């Protein structure tokens, strides 16, 4: 979805596409490579009312 990715694809810089492919493969192989699953926790309000 990321527009910059689309732009990169449009560029046709063979290196850039190779890198994109590498990132895709990384994402498929195990998500931790692309982004560690964030450890979910409550939202914190700055100060009570």
């Amino acid at each position: 979805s990321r527009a910059q990715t689309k732009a990169t694809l449009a560029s046709g810089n063979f290196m850039s596409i190779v890198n994109c492919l590498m990132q895709l493969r990384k994402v498929c192989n195990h998500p931790n490579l692309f982004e560690v699953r964030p450890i979910l926790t409550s939202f914190v309000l700055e100060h009570c009312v």
Partner: protein, 426 residues
């Protein structure tokens, strides 16, 4: 593989860009005018401009009110909050009906915020107390090492978490939570037989910072500002086990929460996502609930509540002499827009049965499907709908895949309708 329910086949309204509805799209058959009205309402909701708008889906039983509601929920998407209800849910025992209604109102209004999470994660190397006194703890990560000074609450958490030196720990700065993720891998051979769980040394730097987006509702903020909800301190335990039941949130707390949300929007850190509140069996609501619902509709911050009703010229619950079009007093009726939903003819019933069979992965012979459709026309559509699963079970018992007429006749002879049971009683 998958489970099937009453509305598993309902995927959307199937309306084009211009707003006109095709005869068969999104799993719906007929009811074009109501679908067009619902699309207009969807546009009204998506505008995120008006508040407190209410409409009434008026029609007979088995006509497509809940189907329309769930289709609206699907079409809007998972981002927006759509809350279905029966009026029976409002009749709580812990708090008054007004409190439940107002809570459901603010629960249907969504808030999306951006928050930065500060994360520390390390294996432990020193434990020194600043002397209830601050503690000094050393931490290392694959990229390096760091020593931290933690507040006494964090010290109590670490003490009560049975952290040793050489343990790997996770500290979330926003909440002050300490979690023991396990024992470092470097000590795997320290013993032969112990209850330790060994985890590898965390990768990267000790301190990490990431920006997440989390979705909250106004009710979630109200609960957060009302009672303690988490924490690893005994103080938190006592604070949250005290006053356990729900309380009547005051108008002042709601006003302050609204002011805070306005400040967040003005700062740009938050965005508002108005949603929908659906109430079914609205006739169950007493006159008091309708009377207060009159007030909530005039409120400046309210979702687009939709009402479904299926009773005509029935008396209003609680009252004894108020004859109303749908059990709704005239005061609330003027606040509503009535969307009429019409019964189904034979062809649409047949098409619906065909699509239901296709969705539940059943194979029906044309003559058997015609018989099922004509018997649904004779008695009721839902009767034909619930008979499909017993028919499929019967077909399997005959080592046969496709449904034949014999299975339908046997199913009719085995299971009876309400009218047949009433005749049997007589």
């Amino acid at each position: 593989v998958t489970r099937t329910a009453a509305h598993t086949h309902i995927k959307g309204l199937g309306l084009d860009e211009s707003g006109v509805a095709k005869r068969v799209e999104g799993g719906f058959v007929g009811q074009i005018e109501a679908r067009e009205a619902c699309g207009v309402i969807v546009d009204l909701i998506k505008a995120k401009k008006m508040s407190g708008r209410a409409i009434l889906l008026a029609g007979g039983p088995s006509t497509g009110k809940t189907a329309l509601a769930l289709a609206i929920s699907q079409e809007l998407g998972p981002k927006v909050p759509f809350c279905p209800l029966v009026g029976s849910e409002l009749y709580s025992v812990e708090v008054k009906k007004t409190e439940t209604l107002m809570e459901n109102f603010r629960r249907a209004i969504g808030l999306r915020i951006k928050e930065t999470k500060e994360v520390y994660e390390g294996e432990v190397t020193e434990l020194t107390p600043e002397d209830i006194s601050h503690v000094i703890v050393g931490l290392k990560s694959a990229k390096g090492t760091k020593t931290l000074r933690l507040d006494p609450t964090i010290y109590e958490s670490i003490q009560r978490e049975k952290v040793s030196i050489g343990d790997v720990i996770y500290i979330e700065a926003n909440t002050g939570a300490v979690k023991r993720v396990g024992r470092s891998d470097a000590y795997a051979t320290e013993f032969d037989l112990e209850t330790e769980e060994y985890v590898p040394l965390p990768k990267g730097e000790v301190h990490k910072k990431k920006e997440i987006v989390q979705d909250v509702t106004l009710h979630d903020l109200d609960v957060a500002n009302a009672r303690p909800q988490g924490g690893q301190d005994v103080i938190s335990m006592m604070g949250q086990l005290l006053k356990p039941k729900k309380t009547e949130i005051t108008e002042k707390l709601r006003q302050e929460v609204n002011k805070v949300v306005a400040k967040y929007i003005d700062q740009g850190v938050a965005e508002l996502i108005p949603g929908v509140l659906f109430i079914d069996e609205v006739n169950m609501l007493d006159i008091e609930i309708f009377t207060y619902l009159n007030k909530a509709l005039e409120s400046n911050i309210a979702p687009v509540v939709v009402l479904a009703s299926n009773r005509g010229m029935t008396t209003v619950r609680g009252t004894e002499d108020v004859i109303s079009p749908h059990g709704v007093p005239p005061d609330l009726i003027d606040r509503l827009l009535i969307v009429r939903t019409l019964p189904y003819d034979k062809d649409e019933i047949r098409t619906i049965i065909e699509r239901r069979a296709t969705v539940e992965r059943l194979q029906v012979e044309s003559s058997a499907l015609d018989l099922l459709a004509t018997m649904g026309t004779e008695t009721s559509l839902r009767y034909a709908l619930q008979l499909l699963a017993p028919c499929g079970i019967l077909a399997q018992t005959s080592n046969r895949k496709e449904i034949v007429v014999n299975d339908v006749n046997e199913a009719k002879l085995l299971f009876l309708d309400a009218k047949r049971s009433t005749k049997i009683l007589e």
